[PDB]
């Protein structure tokens, strides 16, 4: 007494959303969110699908070779949910919406009285270069963000669990490097 | 005369692989490949699943409200395949395996007689900073790569379609910035 067309519609919709998820380019900010939105729906759909599939086996009574598989599926989904919770915790720590949009491992962040800056970053490095200027923008590795306040002497590389501290040593003006309308700030990791 | 348990096994396996795809962290190189490998399998599974589902409708004869949906699915999958082909073309242009592993929009590349360097990059910027040194490594935005040869005066930002040229202006030594065992190279985009 369980419908089948609902299962087929759900799997078709999951295919649609997952296929569209591989088409959205991650260049502009809003598209990023849209991509995540699509992903979210896809994720939900997947859950529904597999959950519904389990119910189908309940009608079939073939749980003997599938209970381990579905336990693994639910365990991995639970780990994914914990990962989303940790992502929200990192968002709260970085007090900006950037961690949800981007998939970077680490986030270079710093606070000002009027704005908070959070930029994606791949791995912990012994030094970090912040490029201002060219409508001033702060960009790291191509990831850019609008300028509203000046830089800070100390910045924090935030992660899921650990956080590192970076201190400014050298500020490079245009007259030093020769690049027009661009200023470089150099930070290095401190040890305590 | 078409099996159903094959469909349920395929959708369960797709759920397993897609759920595991959201667990692999993108920190070390090999994991990256593994992630893509999993993704690849997931993608294939998805195709199979939806393809099989279409065949099921062939048995049902309910193509009236589903032919548009499956045409959209196949169109998006074809666009995804074209995207993979363009990714392989960009890999050949960058003549290294980095573009397959990473998901960056652009790739900063340069050739030497003994090695070719290709580093992920987010967006086209008016300037680029290459950080050498700390076992010397070249790292942009946290994405690091082993050092085997010296830098080049000209580097290329490669994309799916267009390519930009970046020329070196300033090289920052340790004695200038104060950072120990780290050297910074400054490039800017040229106009022709």
Residue numbers in the entry:
A (entry chain B), B (entry chain A): 40 to 173, 181 to 238
From the paper:
The severe acute respiratory syndrome associated coronavirus 2 (SARS-CoV-2) and SARS-CoV-1 accessory protein Orf3a colocalizes with markers of the plasma membrane, endocytic pathway, and Golgi apparatus.
We first evaluated the oligomeric state of SARS-CoV-2 Orf3a2x-STREP in cell membranes by chemical crosslinking and concluded that it likely assembles as a 64 kDa dimer. Despite its challenging size for cryo-EM structural determination (<100 kDa), we were able to resolve a nearly identical conformation of SARS-CoV-2 Orf3a in both nanodisc preparations, determined to 3.0 Å in the LE/Lyso environment or 3.4 Å in the PM environment. The overall architecture of SARS-CoV-2 Orf3a is a dimer and is comprised of six transmembrane (TM) helices, three provided by each subunit, with dimensions of 50 Å in diameter and 70 Å in height. Although the portal could permit the movement of partially hydrated cations (1.5 Å radius), the composition of residues lining the aqueous vestibule is highly basic (K61, K75, H78, R122, R126) creating a positively-charged region that would not be suitable for cations. Within the SARS-CoV-2 Orf3a transmembrane region are two distinct lateral fenestrations that expose the aqueous vestibule to the lipid bilayer formed between the structured loop of TM1 and TM3 (Lipid Site 1) and between TM2 and TM3 (Lipid Site 2). The presence of density in both Lipid Sites 1 and 2 in the MSP1D1-containing SARS-CoV-2 Orf3a cryo-EM maps likely represents two lipid bound states that are averaged together during the 3D reconstruction.
